[PDB]
């Protein structure tokens, strides 16, 4: 007496296999807002009551990355609160079951694997492997 | 982080850094026409 | 409970039906905290209008 | 020519006479007269048909006159900016021509090389509104193709050099409210 | 199944409380209209309270005025209000009123509801003593000794002229030319706890304040100097800066710096 | 040295802790027996601080664009929902700091809508404003392009039927029992089930007199003009019987045997009324005529005037050699006018009980009420616009600034009228709770005594 | 109500993985309003939310749409 043997139960078992879009939305740093730290360690000048332009600040600044912002700059002392986002931006942006081609084969060597950034190393082309191994006359 | 660079670095009167034999102490002046849009977080955050 | 407090008596009369405009204003699905009556009104004096709940419209459709 | 009276808080008004470059730049300069001359008036009351049929109701809406405006952004040693009919904080631009206007000939042909010059205040060249600014620092080379120089203050420079010396409160605003009491034409 | 207007509900939540269990909606805490701003020490004084009264009242602080209000309210009640009919102080063997005025609890739970009682207090304490004037919609909830105290303690806190940060000139040029300047941006580094005010304040159901890496940061203007590592950690670093600064004063820095380039030239 | 005996600082204040260790509190240790004072004592509130928002009004338009969008628009509403509290918010917005609340303009718009919001309340409009900007009685039958043809919702074309059926009746010569003149603030004053207007087609209003009204009837009465003349006689309230009662001393509560000196002055009123031409002594506590009662208030507060005329050994002399303060009875009646209809939703309804003779306000049909408001706002304008003491008196909220401008002695007067009104309420409230008969014993005996 | 990119108006044609369970239940189930009439989908050919004309404006009571 089940119900709904009809076509809608014949599509909804075939069209839903379509793989939705994946965007590695990395975690939002709610409590530690990173962009409100551009104002940390800023000499307020007693004329305009605004932050003086410190030329040193930008050197003790640790650009914490972001998705909606290129690279938010934060002073060095407050760098460690963002330890997860610097581990999520360096990450590769897909569940590593999709990029398992790199981790088990002999691509274990031909790839940067620092904190799961499965990005190819440098690799000479074949025009160069012989350009570098004939010029040596090897 | 001062406007007195060129006149100071020549006060030393460098002549060597153990291999250098410094050839010229010219001043770059790369602050020329720097837009406030280079230090303003309200702007630089709009570009970035 | 509002006549007894303000008048010192039992009401001793037939209570008006059709709740006064302005009563049960935070309630949303009254229908029980009432008779099946409609949500009374706003606290206004505009002529009574049925708040066309999905129910009232169905009765029109009957 | 045109005037403008400046009230620095509890201090009296003072005439600031602007010689508008009505010749080279017509649009942005005639935008100044219509804004100073008190040219757009719309007095209404709700009872007598103010609300019912007309549906104009645009008199609860930025009024397009410099009357009772402010002088908000004052950069000491640099300039004195002021005049906005939309937001008290200095943001937003209003004009005779809607929200704003760009005039291609009138923006490229600008040169800010005199003191006391009077230009427009832009968020970008495509945007010119009621916001003017009176240049106090003598030369302005970085302001060449940005905005329009539609006139200069002809006298009464005492105030634009007395406004500039008014202290900034915490808010980046002058410590005491500089108000534009009443404007007009000369 | 909810009942809004249920005389429980803490009176802030009558929509958010449909969700939450029967066991948790009575306790949901009072927070704010979420648009009510803190009482602000702005300068807007009631239209006609005036000075002399303001100059006197403003002298009293908001515990110097809450205290006065409690005494007056116990005096307004147990006055015309109580002596007029009931009695509010326990009597002895013969029937003499042991204590002078009521006990502080009876006043706390006392509810100025009946119009005859509210007008008997509001013209005397909030209009008479304080020369404040309450709106109609606030006169509704202005019916308790607890609320009478707060209504005053907002409209008198919005009266103290906002403290005027005015500095002289002769001292101003000191803090400018002085070598050691303040960094002064740290307040933002502080971690944000922004969320629904109820879910943020339900957690502080008890002294969850200093607990689990939280801290009620009240801006501190002076620091204890004893045992304060981060204070001695720099008062020596400072005394190591005044000592290095001594060279540049005399000129042994320039020498000891000019001795490097003559060590680093002939090599 | 710094003494320390150990077992002193716990590192946590001794409340939040067990001997050592901070203790846990989780809304399950707590009972529901606290938090049960809420049934009478209301929870704490955040009273917003009153602001004259001129600090937010740095320029002009933002100040005159909330005059309408926020102040006036709260009157069009209150001129629609409850026109009696339309004097309450006029106080609410002026206690909050606004300027022109009692200005000669806000009133002459408040009275404008109050006058007309009636004739589009009987038309069937349920919301006075269509959108943020315009009124719903100005939605023209095109999208917005029609001249004046009002977009008549089904509710209206059933409100315009009940009006037309009331016309045909008095066009047949019968009594036009208009349905919505039994409609008051509680709904049908007759205690009947309210007839809701988008009336079902299986519950058509039936009058056993053979009156025909249908859709073919009201569709031509589209625009605003051809109803203000056709149903003129019903949408318009009547202002005649209320024309001047607010400009007249009436104290519905106060009785002849009620005065601040409860006997001394009324002993004079009995003394003048036995040695009199047409003499009548007072035992009947029945209320004397209104205007002679306010005389004693003008003759009982000031021990100046208590003796100033007590010397007078004749009837009309006391009753008429005091017209000089009878020139003061309006400046006090302007006070007992404001402060009465001002503060609470209740003070106003109790006020109209005295003056316009509403026995119960809650049952007087809206036609009778909107009039009294229209006849009350029509005399707020008189006070604000005609005489100079009217403005400041309106903008005065406390007594301290109230006493100053207008008659200091005139304020001595009615603050013993109000104190006498409220003390009459003291008689009712404390009247209930003074009969004590309880005990362990007599509460037992009061059963059998209750048995027969 | 599909909507045009430029149009500030917001429509409920989402395609987030959290919102497709209800966007199908509109196209195949349809809505049975508590007033007795079946809404958005009442018959045979299930609508194509992505080929709807764009949402032009919120409905008003007096007229149809502002």
UniProtKB/TrEMBL annotation, chain B:
Subcellular location: Mitochondrion
Family, as annotated: Belongs to the universal ribosomal protein uL29 family.
The protein's name in its UniProt record: Large ribosomal subunit protein uL29m
Residues of the whole record sequence present: 337 to 384 of 480
TrEMBL record, chain C:
Domain of life: Eukaryota
Protein name according to UniProt: Uncharacterized protein
Portion of the parent chain present: 63 to 124 of 186
TrEMBL record, chain F:
Protein's name in the database: Uncharacterized protein
Organism: Leishmania major
UniProtKB/TrEMBL annotation, chain G:
Protein name: Uncharacterized protein
Full-sequence portion shown in this chain: 67 to 132 of 197
